[PDB]
Ligand SMILES: Nc1ncnc2c1ncn2[C@@H]1O[C@H](CSCC[C@H](N)C(=O)O)[C@@H](O)[C@H]1O
Ligand SMILES: Nc1ncnc2c1ncn2[C@@H]1O[C@H](CSCC[C@H](N)C(=O)O)[C@@H](O)[C@H]1O
Ligand SMILES: C[n+]1cn([C@@H]2O[C@H](CO)[C@@H](O)[C@H]2O)c2nc(N)[nH]c(=O)c21
C-alpha cells in the first residue's frame with residue numbers, strides 16, 4: 338500500500354511542490370471511482386467558495402448567477418444549506434439544457450433555458466440591477482480552440498455582470514496543443530478533490546475589490562508547468578493513504594475534502610471539527626446517493 | 629487679467645480639485661493659439677513618458693513601437709534626443725499614412741505603411757521577439773462607437789505586444805453619448821499642456837510589472853466627472869497667469885510645460901532648473917518652427 342503522513346493537503350495549485358513528465362497512457366486509466374463523483378466534485382468546490390464569501394460578509398443578499406448549471410442536481414443541496422442557515426440569496430440558473438426537476442418550485446431559484454451570449458449577459462445585467470451578483474461558471478463547449486472560446490466568454494461574464502466575486506472553471510490547454518497566449522482573471526487556483534483521476538482542472542476563485550479587474554497571462558511555458566504539477570498530484574499525491582489522518586476514509590481525496598468541509602458553517606454545534614466534517618460528509622453523500 | 633500664484637500645476641487627472649458644468653458653446657471657441665501646437669503637445673507628453681522609463685532603467689535597449697505615428701515630425705526630435713544622450717533604442721513607426729521624410733535614412737528607425745490589426749500585431753510581435761517593447765499609441769479613427777473601437781484595439785496592442793510600458797491616447801466618451809461601460813488599462817492619467825483649448829484628452833502611462841495586466845472600468849458617471857473636471861481645467865485653470873512663476877512666459881501651459889521639462893535628462897550641465905528648461909524649450913520651439 339502507498340501510505341504516508343501528511344500535515345495538510347495541497348489546497349491551491351501554487352502549493353504543489355513537485356512535478357512529473359506526463360505519461361499519455363494515463364488517459365486510458367479509470368477516470369472515476371465514485372457514483373455521481375462529478376456533482377460531489379462541484380458541490381465541495383462550490384460549498385468552499387460560497388462559505389468564504391459568507392466569511393467575508395458578501396453572500397447575504399446577493400443573486401448567484403450560475404451559468405452552465407444543468408442538470409445541477411447538487412445545486413439543490415447548496416441552496417438548501419444556505420437557505421436553512423438563514424442567508425438570503427436568489428439563484429438564477431441559466432443553461433440551454435434542462436435542469437433537474439428537484440430545482441423547480443422554489444421561489445428563490447429561477448431556471449432559465451438559454452445559452453448565454455454577450456448580448457444576453459447585458460439583458461440579465463439590466464434585469465438583475467441593482468442586486469449584487471456572484472458568478473459561478475461551469476460552461477463546456479475539448480479543442481484548445483474550444484477552451485479559449487469558453488475562457489473568453491467567462492471574462493465577458495465578469496466585465497458585463499460585474500460581480501462581487503466569481504468561481505470559474507479553469508483547465509489550462511495542453512502545451513503540445515498551444516495556439517496562443519491568453520489572459521484569465523486573477524484568483525486562487527482551487528484544487529478539486531474527487532476530480533476525475535487525471536484531470537488538470539481546477540476552479541478560479543476571485544473577489545472583486547474597487548472597480549479594477551486584474552488579469553494574468555498564460556503562456557505555453559505555464560501550460561508545461563500546469564501539466565507537470567497536475568500530473569504529479571494525480572499520479573502520486575492523490576494516490577496517497579494518509580495514515581496519520583484518523584477518519585473513516587484515509588485516502589488523499591477524503592483528507593483534501595476534510596479540509597474544505599471544515600470551513601463550512603453549520604447550525605448544529607459540534608465538540609470537534611471531525612464531528613462537524615463527518616456530519617457534513619454523511620449529509621452530502623446521502624443527498625447525492627453515494628454509498 | 630486673470631492672474632494667480634500657483635505652487636505646482638495639475639500633472640494628473642486625479643489632482644484636478646474642482647469642476648464646472650460643461651458649456652456646449654465652448655466648442656465654437658478657438659481651439660489653438662500656437663502653430664504646430666499638436667506636435668508640441670505630443671512631443672512634451674512623449675518626452676515626459678520616455679524620460680520616466682529612462683529613470684526606471686527600462687528604456688535602453690527597447691524597441692519603441694509607435695502606432696498612429698504619421699506624419700510624426702516631432703518623433704524626429706524625440707529620436708535625436710535619446711540618440712544624442714546615448715540611449716540605444718530602435719523605433720518602429722507604423723501607420724497607414726505617410727511619415728515626414730525627415731524620419732527617413734535613420735538605421736535605427738523603421739517606418740511601416742500599414743494600418744495595424746490584431747493579426748498584424750501578432751506578426752510584429754513574432755518579428756520583434758525577443759526585444760523588450762515600449763508601446764505608444766495615437767491612433768484615431770469621433771463617435772463614441774469610434775472611441776470604444778480605438779480603446780479596444782489599444783488593449784489588444786498590449787495583450788499581444790506585451791510591452792514593458794505603454795503610453796495610450798485617452799479621452800473618455802461623452803456622458804450624453806454613452807453606449808456601454810468599458811475597461812482601459814490602469815495607468816497615470818497624464819494631463820497635456822498645449823492640448824486644444826477645450827480638449828478632454830490625456831495620455832495613459834503604464835509600466836507593466838510581473839505578468840499581470842490590471843484594467844479599470846469606465847462608467848457613465850465617470851464620464852460625467854471627466855467632463856466636469858476637464859471643463860473646469862480648460863475654462864478656468866488653463867487661463868491662469870501664474871505671477872509667481874518667473875519665466876519668459878507666465879501662462880498656465882508654460883508653467884505646466886516647465887514641470888514636465890524639468891524631468892528630462894540632458895548632456896549639458898546647468899546651474900539651475902530654469903536654465904535647463906529654458907534650454908529645452910528653446911530647442912523644442914526652434915525644431916518645431918514655433919516663434
Ligand atoms: N453559453 C452557455 N450558456 C449556458 N450554458 C452553457 C453555455 N455553453 C455550454 N453550456 C452548458 O454548460 C454545461 C456544462 S456541464 C455543467 C454541469 C453543471 N454545472 C452541474 O452542476 O451539473 C452544459 O449543460 C452546457 O449546456
Ligand atoms: N490601425 C491603425 N494603425 C495604424 N495607424 C492607424 C490606425 N488607425 C488610425 N491610424 C492612424 O492614426 C493616426 C492619427 S493622427 C497621429 C499623429 C501622429 N502621432 C503625429 O505625431 O503626428 C492617423 O495617421 C491614422 O492613419
Ligand atoms: C490530463 N490530460 C489528459 N489528456 C488527454 O485527455 C483525455 C481525456 O481526459 C485523456 O484520454 C488524455 O488523452 C492529456 N493529454 C495531454 N497531452 N496532456 C495532459 O496533461 C492530459
Ligand SMILES: C[n+]1cn([C@@H]2O[C@H](CO)[C@@H](O)[C@H]2O)c2nc(N)[nH]c(=O)c21
Pocket residue numbers: 650652654655656802804826827828855
Ligand atoms: C470637450 N468637449 C467638446 N465637445 C464637442 O466636441 C467638438 C470638437 O472639439 C466641440 O465643437 C464640441 O461640440 C463636447 N461635447 C460634449 N457634450 N462634452 C464635452 O465635454 C465636449
